[PDB]
Each structure stands twice: as C-alpha cells, then as structure tokens.
Symmetry: D2
Subunit: 386 residues, 4 copies
C-alpha cells in the first residue's frame, strides 16, 4: 500500500485577490517544496511527480515540471500534468498510488494547483480570422473550467438540477452554506488549519514584501438573512453566489511513499491509503457520486467511517450525497468546505484529503474523501489515519 508522509497546501485566495500576482506554477512549487520539507525528504530522492491543473492555458509548457523545478527537484525527476477537471488534485494522489502499487516507484510527489485569477481570455477566431461581424472574447475559465462540454451549461445548472431531483430546498442549501462558513471561521481561529497551510511569501513589484498566510474567502459576518436574499446565479434555480463557492487561487501537495519505503526510512506517516473509487455518470448527475462503491469493496458501512469530506461544489452536492450515502452530516466537512474556503479547481481535491487527514488530531481513524468533477465523474478515497 501507499502512505501519505506529508501534506501541505497554500492558503486559498479569492479571485483577483491576495494571490493574484502568483502563478499556478508558483503555488505548486511552494507546496511541493514544503511537503518535501515536512517529510524530511530531499528532492533528489523523488521518483516522480503528478500535479493536477484544470485550465492550463497560458501557463506555458508542462506546468507540473515548472512547479517541480521551483520546488527544488532536480531535472532528473519525471513529471506530468493531469486534467480530470475538478477531481484533478485528488486523482493525482490516486494515480501516484497506482504507480507505487505497480512497483515502479517508492517515493512520489502528488498534488494539485490552480490560479483562476490568471487564466487568460481567448480569441477563437484569431488564428483564421473572424472575417465579418462580431466574434467572441472567450473567457477560458468559464469555458474550459466551469462549463459542461455536453449540456453546454454552467456547472451551477447541474447544481440546480440536483436540487430539483433530490428535492433539496433553497433553505437547506442556504443553511449548509452558513455552516460551512461558521465551521471554517471557527476552525481557522482555533488554528486547525495550521497543520495543512504553508504561507506564500514573495517580494512583489516595487520591492513590496507580501505574505499570505491564511484563507481569504471565509465570511464572518454572514447570516441566514443575508444568504436568503441572494438571487439565483445562472437561472432565474436555487443555486446562488452564497451557496456555491466562488473562483479561487490555490495549491496543495503530498509526499507519497510505499509502506515499505516509509518504514525503512523511518518515517511516521500520516495515513495509509486503503483504497479508491471512481465513477462515471451522465453529465447532469454531477451531484451523485462512488463513496458507496468504495465501502462495498472494502466490506464497510457508512457507520464504520469516522469522518467524511465531500467537496462543496454546491451545497446541493453534499446534500444529494446525504440521500445517496446515508451519513450523518455532523460527520461530514466538520470544518467547513469549499463554500467558505473557495474552489481553486485544480487544488480542491488535494485540500479535502489533506484536511480530512489532519482532523482525524482526534488520534483518529477511518476517513473518506470524495469529489465530483465536470462531466459527472466521481472520485473517492478511503484512508486510515494513525
């Protein structure tokens, strides 16, 4: 099996916010470097890295390698950039698990990175010309990142569709949203994010020192009344700017090793990867997805699980999962989620797994992390935290 030796994330930034100046490759390098520092592992020793990134446009050749070089890894470390939309930050970890299990490696770096703030605009008729009449200035973040390729609708449209399907009320979504924010704010104040987060420090333009050491998106200060008064976002629907995360900047990484290698090097791992699941479904079934399948393979019931993390693409997802999974909500995203913390799409997958790990401070046990992704794919990972 595969074990998680270390885990770090950058704090998550608001769109056009605190990490606006920092490229996706830069956030990646920082977490990859920090993860290596935590594991007491030199970059010289890594056998490969995988970094998730959803919208790669304009970031240059092989963003994953660019990050790995920033991290301090030698040219000798093989590298690849992965796109599984949403699920990318976490699919990277599982993929690396697959590599180790196939016996090709014992020390790998895995993760996710996203700089939504820096995704460029495109000119689709730029190359061959528009010839006559108005054309488009395509926002690639919306197009490649948040737009379904089959139904041609914003992701929030699937969020709504799920709300309808499972009879999930606007108020119940709103209440969930409030909980994400309150639970996050409290977790942050209590320092529960200290273990996962590493700061981003840079000398900016004009010599300005910059230090970003805490998550930007948490609203303090919010209330049910405020949430209730929001207008629905992509349908005149129940999804609003309140009950869905925004668009954000962030990154996260892990040092993954075989159980044998970690032992020989005398590292005390954070957790072990028992196994993973993946699901595929019609595009509009984004909310559904996977955890159930994972449990069944491992001869486990929802009851055996101590804690779950389900990415809050929308409140409607977690809630859909409640109907599908049957977990107790008090065991689910105990420190908030994406709604409060933001959703750098490439990084979200890394964060939930990571967070779940640090929480299971309870001298903990069995955790499950799950994510939905564009085109109705589901990814689930079961962990045994020590």
């Amino acid at each position: 099996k595969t074990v998680i030796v270390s885990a770090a994330r950058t704090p998550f930034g608001k769109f056009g916010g605190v990490l606006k100046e920092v490229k996706a490759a830069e956030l990646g390098g920082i977490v990859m470097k920090e993860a290596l520092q935590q594991a007491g592992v030199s970059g010289d020793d890594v056998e490969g890295n995988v970094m998730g990134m959803v919208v790669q446009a304009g970031s240059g050749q092989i963003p994953s390698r660019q990050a790995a070089r920033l991290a301090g890894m030698p040219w000798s470390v093989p590298s690849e950039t992965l796109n599984k939309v949403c699920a990318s930050g976490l699919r990277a970890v599982t993929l690396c698990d697959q590599m180790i299990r196939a016996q090709d490696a014992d020390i790998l770096v895995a993760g996710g990175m996203e700089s939504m703030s820096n995704i460029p605009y495109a000119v689709p008729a730029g190359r061959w010309g528009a010839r006559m009449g108005d054309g488009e200035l395509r926002d690639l973040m919306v197009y490649d990142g948040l737009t379904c390729a089959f139904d041609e609708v914003h992701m929030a449209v699937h969020g709504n569709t799920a709300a309808k399907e499972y009879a999930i009320s606007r108020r119940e979504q709103d209440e969930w949203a409030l909980r994400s924010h309150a639970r996050a704010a409290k977790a942050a104040d209590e320092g529960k994010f200290q273990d996962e987060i590493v700061p981003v420090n840079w000398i900016g333009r004009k010599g300005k020192p910059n230090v970003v050491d805490k998550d930007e998106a948490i609203r303090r200060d919010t209330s049910l009344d405020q949430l209730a008064k929001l207008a629905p976002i992509y349908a005149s629907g129940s999804i609003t700017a309140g009950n869905a995360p925004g668009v954000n900047d962030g990154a996260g990484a892990f040092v993954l090793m075989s159980e044998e290698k970690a032992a020989e090097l005398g590292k005390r791992p954070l957790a072990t990867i028992l196994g993973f699941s993946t699901t595929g479904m019609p595009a509009h079934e984004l909310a559904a997805a996977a955890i159930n399948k994972l449990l069944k393979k491992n001869g486990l019931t929802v009851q055996d699980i101590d804690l779950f993390e389900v990415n809050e693409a929308f409140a409607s997802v977690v809630l859909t999962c409640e109907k599908i999974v049957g977990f107790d909500l008090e065991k689910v995203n105990v420190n908030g989620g994406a709604i409060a913390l933001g959703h750098p799409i490439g990084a979200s997958g890394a964060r939930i797994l990571m967070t779940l790990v640090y929480e299971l401070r309870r001298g903990g046990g069995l955790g499950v992390a799950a994510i939905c992704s564009g085109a109705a794919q589901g990814d689930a990972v079961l962990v045994q935290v020590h």
Copy 2:
C-alpha cells in the same frame, strides 16, 4: 507478469496546419481512433475500465477532452477518463495505463493522444484585468506547446543546441529529412500505413497523411534556418505543426488470454528520464540495461523526429544502426501533432515489426523541458 498487451491500434491521417483536418476538433479525432481501436479490438465500450488521452494544448477545448472523445467513441458515461499532459503525451498515456494494469486496478483500457494544432486558440493575457499601451495577442500553440518554459526559446533552439554539442552537421540533418520523406512516401504507396490509418469522414474523406513532400538535398540546403540565423534547423529538417490523433486498446495479458484475443504486442517495459532543458537517448539505454539487453538485440527503433538533430544525437548516444531506425520515415515527413506523435510511433513500429512477423522494438520520444520516454515491445 502481470504485463500489458496491445490488443489493437489505430490512428487518423496526420493533417497539415490549416489543412485537410482543420475543421475537425481534437476530441473528434480522438473519438474516431478510440472508436476504431475498440472495433478492431473486438471489444465493446461497455467493457472498458478506463481512458487516458494525451493532449498538449487543451486551451479552448472544453472541459475534459478525453471524456469528450470517449463519449464520441461510443463509450458509456461509466468509463472513467482524464486528460494528460507530458510531447511524450501520446505515449505516456499508454505507459500510465500499463502502470494501472500492473497495479491490478483494471484489465481493459483505452489509451492514446490527440492534437488539433489547427484549432488551438490565440489568447489575450491582458483581457481579464485590462491593458494603456499595446499588449499581446498570444499564440497559445507556440507558447504552451512549442516554447521552453525555462529557457523562454523555441524548441528548435534546443534542436540547434543539440546539433552544436554533438557535432551534427546541417548536411547530415538534411540527409535524414530527405530520407524521412522518401521512406514515408514509399511506405504510403506500398500501403504500409493502411493497417494503422483509419479514415476521417459537403462530405468529406481524409484517408491519407498530408505532409509528405515529394522531392532533394539540393532544395533543403537552400532553406533558411528558423529561430537562428546561424542555426542548422530549418522548416525542412524539422516537422511542421499538425493535426492528428491515435489510440490503443490495452489489456492485461491475462484478460486477453481469457478472451481469446491474440494481441499485437506485449509491452516488456518502459523508462523515463529527465534532463536540463537544453538537453530520449539516455532513456533507451536505461531501458536496455534494465532488460539485460543491448542495441543488437532490438530489431527496430522508432525515435520521434522532433528534429533530425534528435535522432542523430541518439545514434551517438545509443549507437544503433540507423538502418533499424524510422524505417518507414518519421515526423519530418508525417507531421507532428504533438499530443499524438507518441501514439503514432509506437503503433507504426508495432505494425512494421508485425509485417516482418517480427520481434523486438523500441519507441522513444523527447518532450519539452527535456524529458524522455521509451518503451520496450515484443511484437508477435
């Protein structure tokens, strides 16, 4: 053991830039190859456990292009999918799948590469936050696909650097290109690419590679070097930008056996190498030492023709006889849809070796930021 076998393989013709496949999207090219490979494999989409598709410049292609291609190929929503980025991508997809099979996580998989350089978009980096004074209208193909993120040069610059370091003359490079063109044309005419090409279908039909130019040394010696006044690489000794896709049905040797499939090839092993940016030769050697093999034991080699300079450096590093090397030509003649070339070289090596009722082959590829991927194959 367990080991990975290539059950089937197909590719599209490789189109010229703004050429015959200009209107066809990369997901579309991918869908066709993924579909044909399953047909040739005699396997239903419903039994595929996964798909990995290489694609270098994903910009403006929509969410998850592999999944788009996968759905276009007839695979159900249940089949999981990804989209990968490594030059090497076409081929990294096959090896990554090989790891998944060896990890014992699946028995049937679809892997490949796709690229539509014709459809890569231009970008406005100042559009979102705003530009006073002129800005850039950036060519994402050049920028994301063909430019070194480290040295901030075009890849041909790296090609020239190799020529300088290994003392590879402009004339030898030109000789290799001529050779690439002649062998490919001969191969097309003898119908050797037929086993691997699947046509792409105001009805239109594209059934043949578009980039072969029939012509000689004299002409090549006359060409201006591209990103160097003083360089040896030219439009002539290097491939252009192109449109294409390729895909494979891959299985565990065990699963194919259970089904009565007689696979094209068994994948013996693979190596990856990494290097400073100005630097697939080292990769091959690595693959050979691990397998207790040497240059002599291998029947044929496919080394992607990123530049004439590349294969020629490898000879100096690996020491193969060029007579065993890109026998039906290469990328200089056939074009380079970057995400796809990795699939093509493996495939087209497998097919030539097969025609020869043959045996061992090595496919190797160079990629941006100096990475190298090589695969060892026993063809049946």
Copy 3:
C-alpha cells in the same frame, strides 16, 4: 463666385478581401490625389488645402487625409483634414466649395477613401478588462460603419423599412439590382469607366478594373436569395452592395483661378443641399435633398439631364422615384453601387465623377448627385457639365 471641378479620378473598386486587400485607405487616397493633380496639370506645391472623407478611421493612424496627401506628393505646407459624414466623399467636395466661396482658397483637393478590408476588430473589454464571463470581439466596420447608432440596427433594416413604407416590392428591387449589373458591365466593356479610373500598381500587382461587377447574373439567381439581417425583409445580398475598397478625388478651383490658369473645367458646381431626417428614413433623405436643391435653383426634375443617386439599396433609388418624380432612365445610367460596390467613404466621390464623365461624353449639361447616409442624412449636388 463659383467652384469648378477641374479633374477627377478614382481607383477601381475592389471586393472585400479582394484585389485591393493589402492596400491601405490612405495609399488608395494618395493615388487618386496624385492622378487628379496630374490630370489637372497642377502641382501639389500649389494646393491651398485638402479634405478626405473616411468613415472608419480606426487603426489607420493619425490624420489619414494627411498621410494620403503626402503620398500624393503634396508638400508639408498643405493643410489637411479627415471628414466623417456614407456622404463623406461628396461632403468633402461641398465643404471645399464652401471654402472657396468664403474666399479662403482657389485651389483645393477633395475626396474620399475607404479600405473596408483593412478595418480592425476591436475588444471593447480590453483597456479596463473583462474580469469574468465572455466579452465581445467587435467588428468595427459593422459597428461604426454599418450599424445605426440610434436604432441599433443594420442599415439593411432601414432599407427594408423604406420598402414597406413606400410599397417597393422585392421584385422591383431585384430588377433594379439586375439593371445595375447589366449597365456596369456594358459601360466597362465600352471603356466608359476609363475617364474616371486610375490603376493601382504595386509589388507586394496591377489593379485596373472594377471587381464587383457580375456578368452571370439573372432574376432567377436574385430572387432565390435569402433576405439579410431580417427574416422576412426584402433586402438581400443581391440588391444591396457589398463591402468594398476604393478611393476617389477631385481638383477644385474658383472659376476665376481656373480661367486665369487656362484650365478647361469639367463642370461648375451650381449648388448643393443637405438634409436630416429621423433615423429610419434614410431612403427618403436624398430625394428630399434633391427637391430642396431644385426649388432653390428654379428647376424641376424635367430640367435635369442626368441623376446619380447612390445605390445604398435598390430600395433607396426607388424610394427617390416616388419623392422626386424622375424618370428611371435618367438615373444611374451606367449602373451604381449595387454593381460596383460601396466603399463607404468613397462612394460620394465616385457618383459625382461618373455623373460628370457621362454627361461630358454627351457634350452635356445639367446633373444631380445624391447620397443618403447614416443617421438619415441626405446630400445633393447640382452640376453644370461643360
């Protein structure tokens, strides 16, 4: 004190993206200005001022008329401005006539030019940014040139409104369109456009014939065409001119100067009229201008030997038939813009020119040139041809 036209020239009219695609508006302008001067037997050193009509100036640089003026071999000392009124080419002449009549000048160069092929697309979101969601890649030629600022509609819409208002049928428009092609082909074939046309020669080529004239055209082909910018309209690609490239220019003088220099004037400008009407009434604007001009000059329609009414739409000329009462055989005798194209800032120049040359050829007399323009403006000129 009156204004005489001493000389006149135009370039052939190119098709959109056609023979003049690589030639800029000012270069086309420099050529007509040069030819006009040469034909008049006058040195640039002697010009007291220049005015060039140009409609979509975007991206052609500072003061295009001055670029053209220098290209024409005119010295630095000669004052220049760029004019924007579809009427710009004519208005440049009338403005110049007012100048001479004010006693400010005795020799002027007036004209108009357009390189519709060279008009850039624009990115209205560019300067301040798009932030999030799609923007527009705006076609300046359609926006600035072909779109009504008031009704926010394509000019074809007003063409249609006119047809409905005056009960001009689709078939009449088509018959008129067809007549234009037939007559333009005939005139060219007979050398009739030689007097106005000057060739454009350049290495990147020889351009000396009007590009847009169709010879294989018939009612059958025309009637099959779909309506444009409406569904249900009567305007089509056939009965409306396309978008085009070209320039036209004139040497103008006071009557006294030309006599003093021993020049044989082509014509004497007797007078002019301008009108403004509500936006939808573009078609009527020129007819009303002619009627105003005629009243002012003691003249009736019967008193005019020939009329040129710019063919913005076939509906326009037919609309003018209803208002003016002229006989259609005394109008656009060698065809019009439907046939030869409409390089917008230059049409007004051609129609005058070609009215002049036709009447000459007839040992001729009295003529009226009229043009409708955007925001429903009307311009008419009466010429006494010698």
Copy 4:
C-alpha cells in the same frame, strides 16, 4: 461678412479612468451643445448645422457628431459632421466660420469632444487572422491618437526634438509646468473657469470641477521626474499633459443674424491661419501660424492682449516664444493642458473659450488662440467684447 461667438461651454476635464470614465464622448458632446444653446438663448430648431471634432472615433458608432446633437436636443433636421484634424476642436469653429462667410448659414454649433478613457483596443489580425505566432493587441488611443503616422514615434518624441532644436532646457520646461498648475489652481479657486464650465450630471453623480490640477507640485518634484519615451529626453510626465476626458462647444452666427436677434456676442472672429510643416516640426507650426495671422491682419505681437497656445508640451509654448516673440505674461494666464489635461479632440475648443472669457472679464479685446496638431498649425484671431 463675419462670424460671432454667441456662447461657449465646456465640461470639466477628467483624468484618464477618472470621474468621466463612464461617460461616452458623444454624451460629453451632447451636454456642451445643449448648454451652449441654452446660454445663447437659441432653440435647437433654429440651428443650421453642426461640426464636432473628435480624434479617435473608433468604437463610438456611426457619426458621433450627430449622436451628440440629438442628445443636445437638436432635431433630425440639423445637418451634422464629425471632423478630424489635435486641432479638431478649434478647426470645427473655423470650418463653421467659412460656412457662414460662404453665406450658407447664419446659425451653427461647433466644437469638439473626446473620451480617451473609452477608446478601445484593437486586434489588427482579427479579421483575416494571425495564422501563426504572436500578434498585437493595439491601443488605438496611442496608435491613432498619439503617434506620428510618418515618423512612427510618440508625440513626446517631437516634443523632445523641439526642445533640442530650440535649446529649451529641462528646467525651463519644468518652470512652465509648475506655472500651469499654479495658475490653473488659482483661477479654479477664484471661480474663473465658472463661465466656461458646465456640470456633468448622470445617475449611475456630479462632476463640476477639472480633475487634473495638481496642487502640491514643485520644481524639485518636477525635476525628479523620469523622461518619457526617450531615456535621454527632456519631456516628462510632469511637463506634458496626460490623456483626458472632455468636450466643449460654441454657438456661432453671422454678425447680421446675431444683431437681428438681439444677441450681444461674446466675440467676433477676425480671421484664422492654418500652417503645415514637416512632421518633426510640430512645435513650430502654431508659432508660424500666429505670425502669419498677425501679418495678414496688419498686426504685431504687441497688438495682442492675450494668447492661448495649447500646452501639448511645455516645449511648444517655449518654442513659440522664440518664433513669435510674445511676452509670456500674456500667454496662458490661467494655465493650460499641462494642468488641465488634453482630451485631444476638445482642447482646441477649450483654449478658444477660456481665452474669450478671460478677455471678457477684463472687459477687453484682442486675442489669439493657437494649437499644434499631429503631423505638424491652427491659429485664430478674435475680438473679445
């Protein structure tokens, strides 16, 4: 036959991306033409035509001058034209003067407008395609507006060239710059721009002051400034104006028509001169334009009470000293474009009016307004009543 200026008004001048950022040029234009009509006591129905200067027309839609006139309340009946000459704002007035003198009209409205903040960027490779390799996102304000078509350089380069050709030191230019802010600050404070300025109101908001005047300037802050567009240059951000938002307009009439209506004109236009020169001789053109206007008119420089020479650069006014030989105490007494900004299409209009109002507050008379324009000169002589 002569032309009189019955009325005049301008909007405040806004900084780039400033207070007027959200106002289109046609709109700035519409307000000024309505105010000029109200001030003159003339109905839009009585107007015989309009001309509005405007430099960068791109993206503003069909006939920006006509858009402005309707917004001003003029009926569809009034003929209109949009004009492009730096000098566009002033030239619209002289153009109209020539129409009145041709006996073609007795009532016209002339002016200029510019919204530099609203000029779009362009994609030259957008229509026919870039094909391969990077292309340009071109800033039309800079390209069409501020760059010489012939010499392919920013106008500041011509600004430098003059200083050098005429030996106008960095220090002299800077003293002038400080002077422009000082005076501009003083008049604004004392209500001296009150006559010309007309407020811009818009619910989205009130703008009734010039935004660009920098109180708090000094010669050591001006001297510390880096040269722009040339590393060895002497024109700076300090001694040249920026890019601005604004508009101005006038109600014009024949002398007879004005007398017929009971109007008491602000001023009478005595004549005007237009000059042309090699492109790098930008600074010299207005200077030559003035001398020609004085001579054609039997006048000497001593004959003029007040001069307005647009502050394209400090270098321009200083070059004009040399050429014309005026006393500077008579030049730009209430500051200029350096302090006020330069919405290029409207500056010519502003200078004529500020001049007229100044001469008028002194109960005075003879004035010359001059301006340089791209591609290298316009001058106007007026009798202020």
